[model samples]
Target: GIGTGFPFDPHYVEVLGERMHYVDVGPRDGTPVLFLHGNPTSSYVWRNIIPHVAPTHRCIAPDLIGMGKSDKPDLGYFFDDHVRFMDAFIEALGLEEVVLVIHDWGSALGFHWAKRNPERVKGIAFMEFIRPIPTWDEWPEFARETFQAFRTTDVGRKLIIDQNVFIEGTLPMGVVRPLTEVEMDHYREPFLNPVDREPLWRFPNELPIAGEPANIVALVEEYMDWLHQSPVPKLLFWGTPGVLIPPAEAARLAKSLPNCKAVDIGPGLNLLQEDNPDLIGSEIARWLSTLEI
Candidate 1:
């Protein structure tokens, strides 16, 4: 029912008693590549990239629970919740020897999962993910004000739930080229109502304000150590004049990894998929060609 021209048909599998949706494309015998998207986007974000590699590898992209076309149950939508669902998602698919391609929150969740099951992960390609969370005082005034506003219960609710700013405003701001009307509708249709918008609200609010969610901080710390220690091949895609994971820090992060390569994919913003899917897709394919797998 996903229609022609799309890479694959939409499929649903049960995970944690809820229907989780995904698009599984490419050859079954080929190496498995799992693509994970972040907030305000879904498997659709990977549409442009999937076809590029599908001829040579298996491409699987899933919509996280409470986002995209998946079911949005009434829940906290915390970091733990997304991780739990993603854990189940991987297991349900019986995927092994996976090459993870992650963006934004997907980087955090995917890296954590890879750390837990290092043997299963073949490689990782991550972009625009949370690195270290700087203290509020260390942040720029606008950043501090934005976090302060998001941390405030009522204001956060109003901005995300009422205004749908994450989709309508922030998402557009992150992309260098303006999204087509159809593309914007595709992203916007997922969270039309306030209740469904809860997941978007939770992401910014849960962003470890003043040492909050010490568990997430601990997990990230643990993963950073694992990222340094693991022998897994990593490809980091970074861009300039953007948000989250700047060029210098991206270079530092790549250097920290024993077997990682950092590539500057040219001018773009946070949602690099929309800006330069061709470069991202080709870079990944080119990098994977060198791997032993």
Candidate 2:
């Protein structure tokens, strides 16, 4: 019965003049599972998965400001600003020993949060994660052109983000089964307005590609240090087709974080959990069993 309908009822908190939206599920005493979503989508991305895990885990999914049900502020969309806000959020909530489950941009968000309080983390499960790439050479020419448009010019503001490029693309191109009209009705609501798209416009250029985003390289190095040196056990789950993260990276995660286990699924885009909830859910439960603590 979890998220049976894509409801818009949001839980809000004010942090540094911004009103952030999030969904906090289950009893207060449950084990914490902080589910962080990536760009364009909000906590709604985890709507299906939350029900599966919320029985025993406190599923907390937040809509990073400027996206979803959160307040759409014109400023404060920088990566660092987001991380800072999240830090304040965690402290405000007094969430302790969290189990981080991340996807897309959430990987970076979760990583930055974990690095700041490594001991506070119980464990982590990364899906379609972000890691430092040698270069931006892997991106195709047309993809880069679109990213450049979104990054530099006004066209991105008027057309790309305003048009819900990320969510709307699901039916025509992104999703394999193709979303039905009824599905789009609920799915497109969060990104329906141009005002709610600031982070969507800012996220791509935020990538530290060849040191373009300035602090990104430094942040990447810092994230890598935590990823490699931190004692936390991480599990990697992947989908077959993701533009942002590849299957090859899963191998690297397993090797680098030897304590980590990786499971790969197929036939999905950004919302991997919705594609195979049972498979994903069961694997997650089994992984949780392995944790000694």
Candidate 3:
């Protein structure tokens, strides 16, 4: 069984001027599986799932700069900052081809990278990351109400920076099962300080809606167009009542996108990996096993 706490030795590489921390395991020559976690959560999010993959693939999970153990530089933690760092991360590592396993903002970032560098991305598996990320009308009321509170300037700062709600409140709400004290502690440890929570706050505000954040919206829209057209083998895990990608949308995507298979993780919300790591891992490994090119 995968136990609590981060199990691997920390690995680091310079991205821009900051040191980006990551977990690197398995054979150096094996096919690379790059796992990108969402806001607030670090590479620790992939702890359990990596075990299922490490034996078969080179498993790499990176902590976005300003989150986890990575050096948090002074720059605003915007979506573009993430993309820039990720672009450098891959280039610095000399990774030629990679299979992406991503969620939340990580999904957005992964899709952005994949869409632009299509040939370099061999496969993609995503969850809780809807393409052309939702607008006001596209999102369900619950998400709207919550994000509205998160986007408002003072209110948003109070919730994310002062209250640390994204971690203390939101993360638990997304998980279906109970997170042990150990697991919860690990999640809480990183953003314990109010000032350290900018990445958490920035993500909600970065969510494109009503075209207000024009650049972010454009990124999502463009990526969705590319993802739909790209014949790269893909796996999409969807959950019931998911905070981001719900079942209905998932089904619609399965029908619409070529070379895409949508797997039902069942009875989960945003963080389906926490709810069904074994299932997601086994399915991903299985899918990759049979994949050609």
Candidate 4:
């Protein structure tokens, strides 16, 4: 029941002259929970989890511009471009006082937006996010080789454009279990063509490393500082043997972040929600009640 399993009806709205696709379900009068995804993935990533919390809260997830079913304009797909479009998307939908469930680059975008509009956010639940990235020598050996090549022009083109490595390789590598063919197909459908593959190629280049993309590093740090000073409640989820934010690092972030609670969802990788949708959703639903939002 790929179609039935993923039965949340699609919706769209115009943002900066391009159509933005999203999923909106749950109660009309309920509190709003906004789910954000990053990279080669989309709202499809949250398909399994949204149902668990939908009964009480409004669940909404948007496909980032140029990813998923959203239109692929001649966008540069820069980090700022995402920020601009996402900002517009929020404004277009008239979203306010939102609870955010964020992952990966979505974490960065969500945190940055929350810092700017702190009063609008109720709480944040994040996993597999970018915090202060490690320096070149400090980065892991495997990641150093992979992202370094991904940052290069020709090398990145071949890896991402000529092929679907992010969808094919990294996505699976970051998950504990094998993805069914249908599940992979949903992720694969978005970036099937070389022209649609640029966003995946650019994300690695935008990732801050040793201060090359100085703005990104500064933004991440600035938000980290805000998280320390701000009283916004946060829920951090970490999986055993994970990829992006590993257990030790998750513990470190939890301690540094104010009003933050961390939870373990047993075995997982970058996409914790992929494997622990029910747990993640139930935890968020329970935690949302605790926030008094």
Write one digit per residue (lDDT tens) for candidate 4, span 79-144. 899999999999998997899999988998999999999999989999988776667764556566
Clashing pairs in 2: none
Per-residue CA lDDT of candidate 2, range 1-293, in tens? 22336553578888777778889877688468898887767787777777677776778888876777777777748887788777777766778889998887788989888888888888898776666655667543435566566666577765556676645652234344555676666666766666666777777768766667768868877987878988788887777665556666667778887478778767755567666767777777667667843
Which 10-residue span in candidate 3 carries the lowest summed lDDT?
Answer: 130-139
**In order, what lDDT does every prediction score?**
0.83, 0.72, 0.86, 0.86
- The positional error of residue 157 in candidate 3, measured at the CA in angstroms, is 0.4
For model 2 the local lDDT of residue 132 reads 62
State the lDDT of candidate 1 residue by residue for 155-257, as single tens digits. Answer: 9889888988778887887787888777888888889877899888888776654576677778887888899899898999988855777677787887888
Report how far off residue 174 is in candidate 4 (Å).
Answer: 1.2
Cα miss at 261, model 2 (Å)?
A: 0.5
Better of 1 and 2 by TM-score: 1
* TM-score of each predicted structure versus truth: 0.94, 0.88, 0.96, 0.96
Cα RMSDs, all models: 2.7, 2.7, 1.5, 1.8
Candidate 2: minimum summed lDDT over ten consecutive residues — where? 170-179
Off by over 4 Å in 1: 1-7, 137-144
For lDDT, the strongest prediction is 3
Error of 2 at 244 (Å): 2.1
